[PDB]
């Protein structure tokens, strides 16, 4: 039964096709891996030196300790810290790329890029303390780019993409515990050092370092969103579609996959100039579709329809209609390069540090972006021509998606109810119980969990209990593909209080109907937008984030990046659910820190719960405990 | 039989004591780990996301590929790259600490530190291009410290502690392959990114990134040596002793253990001012002894005797006479904190990012170094008092050690034969066959190998074949403890040609006898001194390093740092032996790159050989192939 693999009907249909065609999928590779190693599952394995591999039995007799003397506590904490550092390295590497792109753009070195959002640029400069009065925009932008790059290393200030984005009282709590990062790449390196053999060997000390590195990840996320908004525009509400039915047999279908809008944004613009060239080849046009975060980026800004996400990404190929898959980095199953031989798809890498054996590599340079995009799209057009006459099987399955809810857009929507105190109508409805609290869904799909099952099960229970639900990344992807971003489903999905608020906001925005059930706040770096919203609420209320009825759920987490995000959610003060097991259960002391005693440090805490109906109850309890702490009914 | 555990008789004696006293050692923890996991041993395990753990059978049936599609090639290369990045993070973290210390010293913020080697400071400034004429030393030093810190991040120049230390022709080869690092912490982060899930998935591309990150490690090593020489003095020839017999029952015995001379150098100086305070407590004085690299640092500069190294570090404690073990970071078995409860030793950590549960922590600040050192040494004095009346068992085993052969010191010794062309007498004797070639022994001991057995077996064979042998780190430690640094053993150990050269140099230096059989070039960062010597020889000859009859051997390697060092030795052009299995054999394509096709990229290559008599033959063949390529007899 394909329903045990994915709850998405389009994915189920393509799983049937892959099976009859003998094309191995992620689910088949998972089945072939079972049973998985219990040492790795519990975190009780270490390969940090050539005396290893070392392992510790979770229970029973020897081995009980690593060869060097490393305890279970130490081994588990060191492994977790390296995962946080790896996640930080990815989000902040993405941000660094955008900083260099902005710098090039304003220095005259990359004319395909420009300041598109001047309002965003000036507001970021003001937040950072960079003067704007009497300065040319290009000079302000150069200073912002230089400040972004300076946050990667030690200097006379800490990381400003932490200290300028959280309220002073939160920064103070963190500073008292030594948790403010000194530099993003500095912290990543310090983790790698401290976790190497014969260094840090105290679980609490190790985990404090991990919390600090998670804040370096947050800075990378926030910097990425900031810079992408300057370069490509801050999102506003947009209407599009999702799921495999957005592919079109009669078009050149091009997926943008990976992460950085420096690549996907140009593919979108250049594809429109090439419509007549695609038509000369017998297509109707070029149909750009999204996969994973770079898909979210172009969905949020341009309404490009999302094809699929995360674990099911191979299924777009199995249709037979995917002419090209254009990749930068992160979250791309390398299986795509071999599946392409069977499906005909042209898989194209573009970044020097992210190649896949068997894929075609087209170097992308920001200095030649338009030229490089045309070379890529001409490969896609050629591939379309080669499938002239082949039947394709595109499931006729799609949902309507309203998205584009940046924090600026949410504030603007609320301002239609209260022009000069936009956050107040949200707060009023929390106080009166029409909004019980807020839950951010974030993160990936994971082959261990039937695809989307945790996201939808938890979201349904929260929505019925009047929780305002926001989402990013492939959590937003799951919810969009199951109709949670279609305002036509508000009546079915939402409790009466939440429906009343979504309707009041929507009617004030001229929609004649509500906002959607779930607000799509963007890509995974755009988890930083949720931070901006929550920090703005905390500041408006004069309380810290750990007193707000706000929770997060990485319900189906996979990537090291999702571990980093969950960790900074805890660090900034949120109850944070994770719906898969991180490799921590082999140490009860480490588990106790992450799920309990960190409350006394940051006010946040992990909630590890694999059963989604139980997870929803635990998330509601966390929200309601925060309501009670504010003196509110619940 | 303790000879299967260690070839060091003092270690054997303490293993007997530990056994009868029920104190578990590293060897016992290794026995309890057997059989070790074959997936980890071969590199065929991945835990880079929460879909894992993934494994690949080396041979047979499924699993054959990771869940995301990662091949054996990819998994092996990604794991290796993360080990290189971790090694870079340690050596360069050490260097960064020294850069901040020098900066503080010359800004008036840390008066226990100063410019001790003004000649070294000016020569480093000249090498970097920093002007010195008409500048105050403190201003030159501030500029050098600032340049050191700038090499950690991207800027308008590549990493100068690579490009200014290798000859232009070598830099050109590396640059053509994209291998020059852009910034030290930048490269570490880029490795962590590219090796995270769904990123780089091409073995050759991954390994090129690893070679580049290994050059970031080299820069950290060279920067560490440079800055420590400025602050603490460039080594010159010194005579001391090694092995456990350097402990003294009637003294306060204090081991300095870990890595950074910012800590050990001050412990040495302050201990002398506290002699009368130790005597009031009934001791003869404070006897500072070394373990691991920080021991090597104070041995090289001050003649502090070395107690033990690497795998046998617990044995110093088992004597019952070790009153304190003063730690900073790296290579410290965390077992020491629990062994201390049985032996009475006071284990003291000092660095915020390297704590050990159960050890006493005394924060060390460079701004208060002397005060903090006295607090630490008073704990040691108190511990001595508590063992009044307890028998101790110090093996009466020690060797004489001549050390202090910095590259400056080697050039100066050679200059007694040829004042204005000091390298020429060395080259002349290579040409005439009195010196067959040069071999650098480097790296750790590893519990899998009977301690020291590979270092001594290989060195004996090379010395008899007239190879000039230099050593660093715990390879120098092994050789010193077995008499290879005592000039009285030249007749026994050295071939006639090598004896003739060591005698000619020694007699010209007024010794009435030879240089020692092996030249101790210092700590592990001081592998950079061997680079300086080899680069100077290459420059004098007008050839690149990959034409010289110079090889390296990490004969008993353990730490991620040793993997990084071996990798940069290959990258700079050396045949590089490793005497333990790195986790690569699960991929034949990766093994073939590292042992064969990298020759076409850098001219260097790994020689993986666990049998030391065979390794010696392979190293001699590599030397002789280089002689033949220069047209020399062999
Ligand atoms: S660091 Fe310690 S626990 Fe890890 S592999 Fe090495 S000896 Fe084993
Ligand atoms: S990155 Fe790929 S091979 Fe590694 S644990 Fe995740 S699914 Fe498995
Ligand atoms: S023993 Fe299986 S993850 Fe290491
Ligand atoms: S399966 Fe043993 S190292 Fe992972
Ligand atoms: Fe993502
Ligand atoms: Fe060392």
mmCIF file of N, CA and C in Angstrom, chain B residues 110 126 147 168 170 175 216 233 250 257 269 280 366 383-384 389 418 423 435 437 490 554 556 563:
data_model
loop_
_atom_site.group_PDB
_atom_site.id
_atom_site.type_symbol
_atom_site.label_atom_id
_atom_site.label_comp_id
_atom_site.label_asym_id
_atom_site.label_seq_id
_atom_site.Cartn_x
_atom_site.Cartn_y
_atom_site.Cartn_z
ATOM 1 N N UNK B 110 48.067 42.433 28.556
ATOM 2 C CA UNK B 110 48.490 41.142 29.088
ATOM 3 C C UNK B 110 50.002 41.160 29.284
ATOM 4 N N UNK B 126 58.435 40.699 7.218
ATOM 5 C CA UNK B 126 58.965 40.758 5.858
ATOM 6 C C UNK B 126 58.352 39.692 4.955
ATOM 7 N N UNK B 147 47.023 40.466 10.699
ATOM 8 C CA UNK B 147 47.094 39.652 9.489
ATOM 9 C C UNK B 147 46.756 38.197 9.795
ATOM 10 N N UNK B 168 56.528 29.955 -5.117
ATOM 11 C CA UNK B 168 55.590 30.321 -6.173
ATOM 12 C C UNK B 168 55.199 29.185 -7.121
ATOM 13 N N UNK B 170 54.834 26.015 -6.556
ATOM 14 C CA UNK B 170 53.889 25.166 -5.828
ATOM 15 C C UNK B 170 52.549 25.866 -5.688
ATOM 16 N N UNK B 175 46.907 26.599 -7.188
ATOM 17 C CA UNK B 175 45.907 27.538 -7.672
ATOM 18 C C UNK B 175 45.230 27.031 -8.939
ATOM 19 N N UNK B 216 44.247 24.874 4.688
ATOM 20 C CA UNK B 216 43.843 25.724 5.789
ATOM 21 C C UNK B 216 44.442 25.214 7.089
ATOM 22 N N UNK B 233 60.008 32.459 22.058
ATOM 23 C CA UNK B 233 61.381 32.264 21.578
ATOM 24 C C UNK B 233 61.471 31.123 20.565
ATOM 25 N N UNK B 250 60.264 13.288 45.552
ATOM 26 C CA UNK B 250 60.452 14.320 46.564
ATOM 27 C C UNK B 250 60.102 15.718 46.072
ATOM 28 N N UNK B 257 49.857 19.427 29.851
ATOM 29 C CA UNK B 257 49.284 18.475 28.897
ATOM 30 C C UNK B 257 48.258 19.211 28.035
ATOM 31 N N UNK B 269 57.491 29.360 33.834
ATOM 32 C CA UNK B 269 58.168 30.502 34.460
ATOM 33 C C UNK B 269 57.683 30.707 35.900
ATOM 34 N N UNK B 280 58.565 25.119 51.479
ATOM 35 C CA UNK B 280 57.881 25.238 52.757
ATOM 36 C C UNK B 280 56.907 24.086 52.979
ATOM 37 N N UNK B 366 44.650 35.375 29.812
ATOM 38 C CA UNK B 366 45.981 35.864 29.487
ATOM 39 C C UNK B 366 46.227 37.164 30.252
ATOM 40 N N UNK B 383 48.312 19.079 46.907
ATOM 41 C CA UNK B 383 48.200 17.658 46.578
ATOM 42 C C UNK B 383 49.470 16.918 46.970
ATOM 43 N N UNK B 384 50.636 17.519 46.713
ATOM 44 C CA UNK B 384 51.878 16.931 47.192
ATOM 45 C C UNK B 384 51.812 16.691 48.690
ATOM 46 N N UNK B 389 54.126 10.539 52.859
ATOM 47 C CA UNK B 389 54.163 9.195 53.396
ATOM 48 C C UNK B 389 53.667 8.070 52.509
ATOM 49 N N UNK B 418 79.178 25.834 5.924
ATOM 50 C CA UNK B 418 79.123 26.717 4.762
ATOM 51 C C UNK B 418 78.340 27.953 5.196
ATOM 52 N N UNK B 423 72.325 25.668 3.195
ATOM 53 C CA UNK B 423 71.652 24.469 2.720
ATOM 54 C C UNK B 423 72.542 23.610 1.842
ATOM 55 N N UNK B 435 73.497 11.119 2.488
ATOM 56 C CA UNK B 435 72.105 11.293 2.910
ATOM 57 C C UNK B 435 71.247 10.795 1.743
ATOM 58 N N UNK B 437 67.874 10.564 1.689
ATOM 59 C CA UNK B 437 66.730 11.451 1.586
ATOM 60 C C UNK B 437 66.332 11.872 2.981
ATOM 61 N N UNK B 490 74.362 7.125 17.873
ATOM 62 C CA UNK B 490 74.572 7.282 16.435
ATOM 63 C C UNK B 490 75.272 6.067 15.840
ATOM 64 N N UNK B 554 53.097 9.203 9.157
ATOM 65 C CA UNK B 554 52.202 9.259 10.329
ATOM 66 C C UNK B 554 51.967 7.818 10.752
ATOM 67 N N UNK B 556 51.556 5.908 13.353
ATOM 68 C CA UNK B 556 50.641 5.399 14.373
ATOM 69 C C UNK B 556 49.480 6.380 14.585
ATOM 70 N N UNK B 563 45.107 13.288 10.426
ATOM 71 C CA UNK B 563 44.543 13.140 9.086
ATOM 72 C C UNK B 563 44.711 14.426 8.290
#
